[PDB]
Amino acid sequence: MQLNATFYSGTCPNASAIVRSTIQQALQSDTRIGASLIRLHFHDCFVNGCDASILLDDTGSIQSEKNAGPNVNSARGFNVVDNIKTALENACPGVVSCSDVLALASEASVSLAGGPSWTVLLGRRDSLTANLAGANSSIPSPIESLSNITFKFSAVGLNTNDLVALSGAHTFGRARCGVFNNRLFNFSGTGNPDPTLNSTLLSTLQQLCPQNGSASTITNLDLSTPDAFDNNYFANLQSNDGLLQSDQELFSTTGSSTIAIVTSFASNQTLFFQAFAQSMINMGNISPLTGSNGEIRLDCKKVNGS
């Protein structure tokens, strides 16, 4: 059973519209929501495939993924996912799955943010279980080596091209102090700050994230255009303005093939969009539940019958 773009064509003709419409409203009170929703789709596909398992909440038997290191005090926008699901539920009762919902939301979010559009493949069914442990070992960390990070991407089915391109989703969105302050004062026990981090920026961050201050203070992943989906994320890397250690590693790791891909995207926005749109379909195609597998949740937070 293969995913396709006209799967809900006869049952929910305007699904793409409803999703877009809802998000564009949420974007009225939260410019950040665009980047938050796409990340959820990211975290969903890297664990047990794109099955919307990340949306399930804790119950006696379900150990919610929302608690894995990557998600706890980080993942957000679940309330909006429900608003999207509700709209879809009024217009199209029991039709659209939460898995497809996150896939559709990702496209709409990038789109409204000024980014590319792409034919979204639908037909995913919702899982009946979550995977907390797998979320802790399958999702890459910003302090992991470019090597370690590449590996985890191979494990789900994405290559180096998919890596650099999908890393551009950091062109907008936020990140807390705790996920990068390691580069601000004593980087890897050397007594000094990460040398691949621009000097001007470093200072601004040492103030934003003092050694004893809150680890949950946030800043923009892209100091250039915090909410616009453009190719600046890569321009930033060239100036050593990459926020996350994983970000800069894509460009400042001498002798890596990722360097040409980065300079390519920072040089031509069309290429980046094409590659990105491409790598987004690819990630959406990971281990999906189809046919008689999984179900179509009426409420994304729990399994039906619960």
Binding string, residues 56-85; x marks residues near ligand HEM by CB under 6 A: ------------------x-x---------
Q: Which of 7, 12, 26, 42 binds ligand HEM (CB under 6 A)?
A: 42
Q: Which of 53, 167, 256, 258 binds ligand HEM (CB under 6 A)?
A: 167
The phi, psi pair for 289, rounded to 5°, reads -90, 120
Q: Interface residues for Ca ion in 207-226 (CB under 5 A)?
A: 222, 225
Q: Which of 22, 36, 53, 97 binds Ca ion (CB under 5 A)?
A: 53
DSSP-assigned beta bridge partners for residue 219: 175
CB of 161 to ligand HEM, least distance (A): 13
Of 27, 22, 25, 8, the C-alpha closest to 83 is 22
Catalytic option among 43, 85, 183, 297: 43
Which positions ≥6 away from 66 have C-beta within 8 Å?
54, 57, 58, 72, 75, 78
Q: Which of 34, 35, 44, 297 binds Ca ion (CB under 5 A)?
A: 44
Q: Interface residues for ligand HEM in 121-160 (CB under 6 A)?
A: 140-142, 149
> Are the CB atoms for 142 and 262 separated by under 8 Å?
no
Give the DSSP per-residue string, 114-134. T-------B--BB-S---HHH
> Are the CB atoms for 107 and 120 separated by under 8 Å?
yes
171 is in an annotated binding site: yes
CB of 39 to ligand HEM, least distance (A): 4
> Are the CB atoms for 169 and 230 separated by under 8 Å?
no
Using CA atoms, how far apart are residues 104 and 189, in angstroms rounded to an integer?
43
The phi, psi pair for 166, rounded to 5°, reads -70, -25
CB of 141 to ligand HEM, least distance (A): 6
- Residue 43 among the catalytic residues: yes
44 is in an annotated binding site: yes
Nearer to ligand HEM, 101 or 244 (CB): 244
Q: Work out whether 171 is an interface residue with Ca ion (CB under 5 A).
A: yes
Using CA atoms, how far apart are residues 24 and 28, in angstroms rounded to an integer?
7
> Can you say which residues are annotated as belonging to the binding site for substrate?
140
Binding site for Ca ion (CB under 5 A): 44, 47-48, 53-54, 171-172, 222, 225, 228, 230, 232
Catalytic residues: 43
> Can you say which residues are annotated as belonging to the binding site?
44, 47, 49, 51, 53, 140, 170-171, 222, 225, 230
